[PDB]
Amino acid sequence: VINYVEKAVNKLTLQMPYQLFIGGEFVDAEGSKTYNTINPTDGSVICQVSLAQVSDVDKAVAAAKEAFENGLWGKINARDRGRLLYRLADVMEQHQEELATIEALDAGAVYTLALKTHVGMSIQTFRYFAGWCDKIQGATIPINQARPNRNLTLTKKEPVGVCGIVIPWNYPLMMLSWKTAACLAAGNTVVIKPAQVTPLTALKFAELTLKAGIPKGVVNILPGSGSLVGQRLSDHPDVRKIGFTGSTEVGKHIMKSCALSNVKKVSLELGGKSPLIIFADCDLNKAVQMGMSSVFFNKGENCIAAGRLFVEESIHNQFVQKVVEEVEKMKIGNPLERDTNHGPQNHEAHLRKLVEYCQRGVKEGATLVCGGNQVPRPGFFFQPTVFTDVEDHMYIAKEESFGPIMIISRFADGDVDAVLSRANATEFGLASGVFTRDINKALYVSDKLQAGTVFINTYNKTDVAAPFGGFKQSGFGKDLGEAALNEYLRIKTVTFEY
């Protein structure tokens, strides 16, 4: 029997585990330490959650190691491992309303969006990777023959072993799912650290692994702080791989820690300052719709959000007025209400960063066209914001907001290479976009953009089959697609002579 926090909301009775998940069991932290998780819609405490300590990380890694080395997970067929992951996706789908509600409460995710993306995409993720398990293939290789003898060379794809996954708070279930699905499909076991401020879908996911029949110790979940739990994962001598999504500075420190312990493999998705170039020959009304999506989707708490929009001089003014007209129509409110378009920011500290961000933008001389402030109501709501007259030297031209802030610069009519130069003048390279009806421009611009993803006449179009990862200081390695599996596999070369 599992201890729950029960809550009746959204016409459901939520049953939320709140303890550490280690070796198939929900257990209190060492010395029963806990912390509060906060609802961004009204600032209230949802419940108390176990606060993992160093000894708890060690118990989790030990359980993951045992599950990998001696447990059923390491012995079953690749095809049966896949069956378990498909059953897990089915169990998640049976609980999708509940998971989406927990996400609305814990993260401020608009409920209708959370069904489709936060939860719906996580289900797609497990189903996609489940189908990879028995389709992961090595090679046979036509090497030179040590005549008069013969040689056969093959490669074997093998699991890396115990992995640590450290994730951020913007899409708690979905980020967990991206990495976990690929990690488990490859035959590994895992210790997951959700962001401290958003542990609840992760703990509910953990209970779902029990319903799906995932062997004990395969998945272990440790709510708690990065500087304690995350740090110990990256230092642990039995952990062989870290998968990380978060900030550039923490990513640096994680890679350092992987280096100084046991040269564990690492992949890093480190956010960005993604440019969107909008030419005068685009479909303007579509560009407004997609341009706004690029910035405001999931209240701007979106790794690939367009952090700058460059708009061609001759449509710039019409583009801005049309955006303001559409911004006025956005319904801000409780994420659980079906008419809500724009939910609260994830947590209070982040809201404060956003207020300070927009003060600095006004200070340095950009034109505030709308928004810029906390919305007057309970919780942590921020008004959808539009800046124009942004210049390349400005702080808001360089720094990632991670909030609903459209940062617009103009470019001269016909100025393709000049605008690309401005778009590429960043140490980030996560995403980018271009809107234009002209095929020659669309193709040339996507070639020249220095980003891991280029959207053409769309934005936010991710898919579980399409690899997602950054260039330069946005990190390296892919989540999603076949490419993601390579992070979680090792290649063994076997050469016979006969």
Ligand X SMILES: NC(=O)C1=CN([C@@H]2O[C@H](COP(=O)(O)OP(=O)(O)OC[C@H]3O[C@@H](n4cnc5c(N)ncnc54)[C@H](OP(=O)(O)O)[C@@H]3O)[C@@H](O)[C@H]2O)C=CC1
C-alpha radius of gyration, the chain, whole number: 24
Broken C–N links (> 2.5 Å) in the chain, after residues: none
CA proximity to 141, closest of 128, 160, 154: 154
Q: Which stretch binds ligand X (CB under 6 A): 124-132, 247-255, 317-325, 487-495?
A: 247-255
Rounded distance, CA 345 to CA 383, Å?
10
Site for ligand X in 252-291 (CB under 6 A): 253-254
Name the token pair of 265: 């493999």
260 makes contact with a second copy (CB under 8 A): yes
Rounded distance, CA 427 to CA 423, Å?
11
Answer with the entry of a second copy, ligand X, none that 236 interacts with (C-beta below 5 to 8 A by kind): none
Q: Using CB under 6 A, count the residues that bind ligand X.
A: 18
Answer with the entry of a second copy, ligand X, none that 136 interacts with (C-beta below 5 to 8 A by kind): a second copy
Shortest Cβ distance from residue 62 to a second copy (Å)? Answer: 18
H or E stretch including 375? none
Identified binder of a second copy from the candidate list 6, 31, 137, 338, rule CB under 8 A: 137
| Residue closer to a second copy (CB basis): 127 or 347 | 127
Active site residue 282: no
Cα pseudo-dihedral 120, 124, 127, 132, rounded to 10: -160
Identified binder of a second copy from the candidate list 252, 353, 360, 398, rule CB under 8 A: 252
116 makes contact with a second copy (CB under 8 A): no
CA 201-121-209 angle, to 5 degrees, is 45
> For residue 380, which amino acid is it?
F
| Residue closer to a second copy (CB basis): 29 or 295 | 295
Rounded distance, CA 156 to CA 90, Å?
30
Active site residue 303: yes
Q: Which stretch binds a second copy (CB under 8 A): 14-22, 25-33, 347-355, 480-488?
A: 480-488
Answer with the entry of a second copy, ligand X, none that 325 interacts with (C-beta below 5 to 8 A by kind): none
One symbol per residue from 453 to 472: x for binding a second copy (CB under 8 A), - otherwise; what is it?
xxxxxx--x-xxxxxxx-xx
CA proximity to 221, closest of 358, 451, 20, 78: 20
396 in a known ligand binding site: no
CA 378-379-383 angle, to 5 degrees, is 90
Rounded distance, CA 320 to CA 313, Å?
11
248 makes contact with a second copy (CB under 8 A): yes
157 makes contact with a second copy (CB under 8 A): yes
Answer with the entry of ligand X, a second copy, none that 196 interacts with (C-beta below 5 to 8 A by kind): ligand X
Answer with the entry of ligand X, a second copy, none that 452 interacts with (C-beta below 5 to 8 A by kind): a second copy
Identified binder of ligand X from the candidate list 71, 74, 226, 333, rule CB under 6 A: 226
401 in a known ligand binding site: yes
Shortest Cβ distance from residue 231 to ligand X (Å)? Answer: 4
253 makes contact with a second copy (CB under 8 A): yes
CA 52-240-31 angle, to 5 degrees, is 15
334 makes contact with a second copy (CB under 8 A): no
| Residue closer to ligand X (CB basis): 270 or 306 | 270
Shortest Cβ distance from residue 475 to a second copy (Å)? Answer: 6
225 makes contact with a second copy (CB under 8 A): no
225 makes contact with ligand X (CB under 6 A): yes
CA proximity to 365, closest of 340, 394, 326, 406: 394
Q: Which residue has the tokens 């040269």?
A: 263
Rounded distance, CA 413 to CA 407, Å?
19
| Residue closer to ligand X (CB basis): 196 or 426 | 196
Identified binder of ligand X from the candidate list 247, 289, 374, 446, rule CB under 6 A: 247
68 makes contact with a second copy (CB under 8 A): no
One symbol per residue from 379 to 398: x for binding a second copy (CB under 8 A), - otherwise; what is it?
--------------------
Instruction: Report whether 54 contacts 232 (CB < 8 A).
Output: yes
Phi, psi of 176 (to 5 degrees): -55, -45
231 in a known ligand binding site: yes
Answer with the entry of ligand X, a second copy, none that 437 interacts with (C-beta below 5 to 8 A by kind): a second copy
How close are the terminal C-alpha atoms of the chain, in Å?
Answer: 58
| Residue closer to a second copy (CB basis): 339 or 447 | 447
Question: How many of the other CB atoms lie within 10 Å of CB of 324?
Answer: 14
Cα pseudo-dihedral 391, 395, 396, 401, rounded to 10: 160
DSSP assignments along 31-73, one per residue: GG-EEEEE-TTT--EEEEEE---HHHHHHHHHHHHHHHHTSGG
Q: Summarize the annotated binding site for NADP(+) as residue ranges.
A: 167-169, 193-196, 226-231, 246-247, 269-270, 353, 400-402
Q: Summarize the annotated binding site as residue ranges.
A: 167-169, 193-196, 226-231, 246-247, 269-270, 353, 400-402
Which of the residues are catalytic?
269, 303
**Which positions touch ligand X (CB under 6 A)?**
166-169, 193, 195-196, 225-227, 230-231, 234, 246-247, 250, 253-254
